Amino acid sequence: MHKEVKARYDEQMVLKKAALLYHFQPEQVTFLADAENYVYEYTDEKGSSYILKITHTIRRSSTYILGEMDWIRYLSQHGISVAKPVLSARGKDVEAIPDQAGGAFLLRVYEKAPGRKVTEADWNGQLFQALGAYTGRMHQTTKQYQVKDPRYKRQEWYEEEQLKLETYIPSDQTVVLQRKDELMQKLHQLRISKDVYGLVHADLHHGNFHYHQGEIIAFDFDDCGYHWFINDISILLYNVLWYPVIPYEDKAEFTGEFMSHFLKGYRQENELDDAWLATIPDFLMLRHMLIYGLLHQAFDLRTLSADESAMLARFRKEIEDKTPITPFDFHQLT
Ligand SMILES: Nc1ncnc2c1ncn2[C@@H]1O[C@H](COP(=O)(O)OP(=O)(O)NP(=O)(O)O)[C@@H](O)[C@H]1O
Ligand SMILES: CC(C)C[C@H](NC(=O)[C@@H](O)[C@@H](O)[C@@H](N)CC(N)=O)[C@@H]1Cc2cccc(O)c2C(=O)O1
Ligand SMILES: [Ca+2]
Ligand SMILES: [Ca+2]
Hints:
The protein is an alpha+beta fold. About 40% of the residues lie in helices and about 15% in strands. The protein has a domain of about 210 residues: Aminoglycoside phosphotransferase (APH), C-terminal lobe (Aminoglycoside 3'-phosphotransferase, Chain: A, domain 2), CATH 3.90.1200.10. The strands form three sheets. Strands 1, 2, 3, 4, 5 and 6 form a six-stranded antiparallel β-sheet that branches. The protein has a two-stranded antiparallel ribbon with strand order 7-10. Strands 8-9 form a two-stranded antiparallel ribbon. The chain is globular and about 55 Å long. Phosphoaminophosphonic acid-adenylate ester binds next to strand 1 and strand 3.
């Protein structure tokens, strides 16, 4: 996490309190991750599995998180399989533990999604179609969602802190910053309506869902916010192109294969006008820019490996040159 949060975190005290709030024994806790949030797995008395995610008010308010929890509950009540929030013993979706410094650690729990992450055996057109139908149902459902408290309102796409590349990258990279500013201006020219824009997951990839008996169960809604539906799609495409489970021989051909199957599924559940498909390259480029910033947080600029330096140089050059993320001509899908 943030170093201040790490400095304030008394892990034993927090897990002791969490054990009381969520009715589990300390001995049944497994540490999973600490890079972004603190994430743990546990089992309760009856043997069911749960995921405990801990953040802090320095990163996000309780009410912002409650907006995610409210939306996930709405999706679940409309027949979408998601890792559902679990109320604490006090009937709360988010539990705050004061840190004695004016802030609070924010605890929340979800059901552990059944199954596990996709494997080589799963990486095929059937998966891609299932992802399309899952995403399509999410988009069709979200159209009717209304925020119940103004404090719970999730961000608009352009409010994303990680798009503020000037915060993350060297200030002499004026061309990269020009490219980002210009692309943002172009995306702001797109029309917004209920049928094309809404609250979406915004971090879809195969690290953020399980596959169980041929069905998708998503989790990690922590970046959910208001986007064009085609950006939710584009983010998933970016991610399958970046870390494919099986290497592809030809990036353009794979893009076409993924998209053909995905869209076949998507059409089962939602109606998206073909004109949006042409915007995918622009949204892929925006994601590429966001990742470039992230790599600067990820890497120590003062002790870079040769591979890290090469990756940063590649992203920079691609952004400056406007090299498309994929060579695929999206007009082929029409
Ligand atoms: N509801 C869930 N069901 C099953 N496994 C989960 C669930 N939530 C999280 N996990 C697992 O725990 C890991 C970390 O959780 P995640 O919510 O992705 O953490 P994060 O702190 O947001 N880090 P990041 O992966 O950078 O988004 C995931 O990659 C899964 O392996
Ligand atoms: C450390 C980070 C660069 C890792 C990256 N994650 C992302 O690119 C996104 O989660 C972020 O870009 C996103 N959280 C940014 C945001 N603020 O919405 C990667 C993306 C990814 C793609 C395909 C499969 C995966 O398992 C993953 C994965 O787990 O994470
Ligand atoms: Ca994740
Ligand atoms: Ca996350």
